[PDB]
């Protein structure tokens, strides 16, 4: 099963309406694990299995680092705004992480965004930063001059991040490695006169990864399939649907179990 660990940072210059200047949140798959902001000034667990498995010394150490990274984020955003000749409120974001895939092969990523748009994308294979414009190119030039830091980032992505992910996965096993099979139903209704719609609806499933498709005589529909988003139900489980307008059967694949609902 595919798993991921990611840490995000959000910086807001001149924030209004009680919005913090800085937020940092961690995730294991779709699950929040850690939280830090410029209001609390404390790094806290966001999952009970994180709280129960990491001693106060972990939270104390990371609170110090996050306060440091909060300061650096404020300065970086000010330098970006100066480069752009931008006034008022602007955002700066960072996402760092890794994935451990089904075959044991791994992925790693480190990205930045300015105003919610890609700014700098790290390439750990060439040890280089991809820059979207001339302002990002100036930062790319500066970061690339520090070869040791690029190597440190490649090691963190490929080795450290994967070790943290595996550690957090063991802590959260009962949540992260569980399987809650879907409850699937097929609904049939004449909508506009002469147009019948078939909805294949699934709910109560975990993990959120589900494949839902419509088949005509055991072959892939050439017609348009309308897809429902995989949505959280609010109880740790998910729901989704797929519809067609009409021999038809709905196919559902979830956690190594295939299901067919013939109409």
């Amino acid at each position: 099963r595919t798993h991921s660990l990611r840490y995000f940072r959000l910086g807001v210059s001149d924030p209004i309406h009680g919005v913090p200047e800085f937020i940092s949140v961690g995730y294991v798959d779709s699950h929040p694990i850690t939280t830090y902001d410029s209001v609390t000034r404390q790094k806290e667990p966001r999952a009970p299995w994180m709280a129960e498995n990491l001693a106060p010394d972990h939270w104390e150490r990371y609170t110090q680092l996050l306060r440091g990274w909060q300061q650096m984020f404020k300065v970086e955003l000010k330098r970006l705004q100066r480069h752009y000749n931008h006034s008022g409120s602007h955002t700066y974001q960072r996402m760092i992480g890794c994935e451990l895939l089904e075959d044991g092969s791994t992925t790693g990523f480190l990205q930045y965004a300015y105003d919610g748009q890609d700014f700098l994308i790290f390439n750990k294979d060439t040890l280089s930063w991809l820059a979207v414009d001339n302002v990002a190119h100036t930062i790319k030039q500066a970061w690339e001059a520090n070869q040791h830091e690029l190597l440190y980032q490649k090691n963190w992505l490929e080795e450290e991040c994967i070790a943290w992910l595996k550690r957090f996965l063991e802590y959260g096993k009962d949540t992260l490695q569980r399987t809650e099979p879907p409850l699937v139903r097929v609904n049939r209704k004449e909508t506009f006169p002469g147009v019948t719609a078939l909805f294949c609806k699934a709910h109560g499933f975990y993990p959120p990864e589900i494949y839902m498709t419509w088949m005509k005589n055991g072959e892939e529909i050439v017609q348009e399939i309308d897809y429902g988003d995989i949505l959280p139900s609010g109880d740790g489980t998910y729901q989704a649907w797929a519809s067609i307008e009409l021999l038809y059967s709905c196919h559902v694949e979830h956690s190594g179990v295939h299901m067919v609902l013939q109409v």
Epitope: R67, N155, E160
Partner: antibody, heavy 109, light 113 residues
């Protein structure tokens, strides 16, 4: 991580070569640093390794083996000025530095 | 880049003492270490950036103040003979990464009865 080891003292001859070994045992790894500290002076940065390989800087070279959890600082064409303590430091999973007790290098003229 | 005072100091047991440190390298991270024979550098206190400080490995008998981005002072409130050591102030751009430390010249402290 738990511990870092390097020899207490090393003696070599002027003009020759010396290898200062450093083994570390940490939970997580974010780099290994070498510092030089002359008697009665402050430590100064020499090198940094995070991935496998040898990094050369003049007469000095720094090696790292991740699988072996081992590093060495190699000093070629030894000079009297090379007499100092060599400090080995490893950065753990929480970015904390674990320092070795140092290796005093004595050069025989 | 790192200025540390005083280079030498003799104190009586129970005396108060402040060690100064200033860095002009525009670094965020500052550290106070003690160096003793037969052992590796031991961190007393550190400051990851302006506005924050935390205990190191050996904080007992010490206190710190990160006064501003440049200054990080170490206080010995009641000098004890076990505090006889060589104290080093250091700084790095930030705590994590391949960031090189720059050390101050050292402060040789002797605490006597």
């Amino acid at each position: 991580g738990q511990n870092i080891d390097q020899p207490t003292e090393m003696t070599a001859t002027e003009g020759a070569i010396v290898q200062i070994n450093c083994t570390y045992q940490t939970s997580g790894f974010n780099g290994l640093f070498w510092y030089q500290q002359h008697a009665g002076e402050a430590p100064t940065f020499l090198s940094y390794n995070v991935l496998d390989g040898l990094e050369e800087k003049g007469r000095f070279s720094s090696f790292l083996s991740r699988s072996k959890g081992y590093s060495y600082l190699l000093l070629k064409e030894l000079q009297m000025k090379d007499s100092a303590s060599y400090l080995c430091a490893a950065e753990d999973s929480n970015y904390q530095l674990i320092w070795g007790a140092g290796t005093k290098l004595i050069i025989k003229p | 880049g790192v200025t540390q005072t005083p280079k030498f100091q003799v104190l009586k047991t129970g005396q108060s003492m402040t060690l100064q440190c200033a860095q002009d390298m525009n670094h965020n991270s500052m550290y106070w270490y003690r160096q003793d024979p037969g052992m590796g550098l031991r961190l007393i206190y550190y400051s990851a950036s302006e506005g924050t400080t935390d205990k190191g490995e050996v904080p007992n008998g010490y206190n710190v103040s990160r006064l501003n981005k440049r200054e990080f002072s170490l206080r010995l409130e009641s000098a004890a003979p076990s505090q006889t050591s060589v104290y080093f102030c250091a700084s790095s751009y930030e705590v994590s990464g391949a960031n090189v430390l720059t050390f101050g010249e050292g402060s040789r402290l002797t605490v006597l009865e």
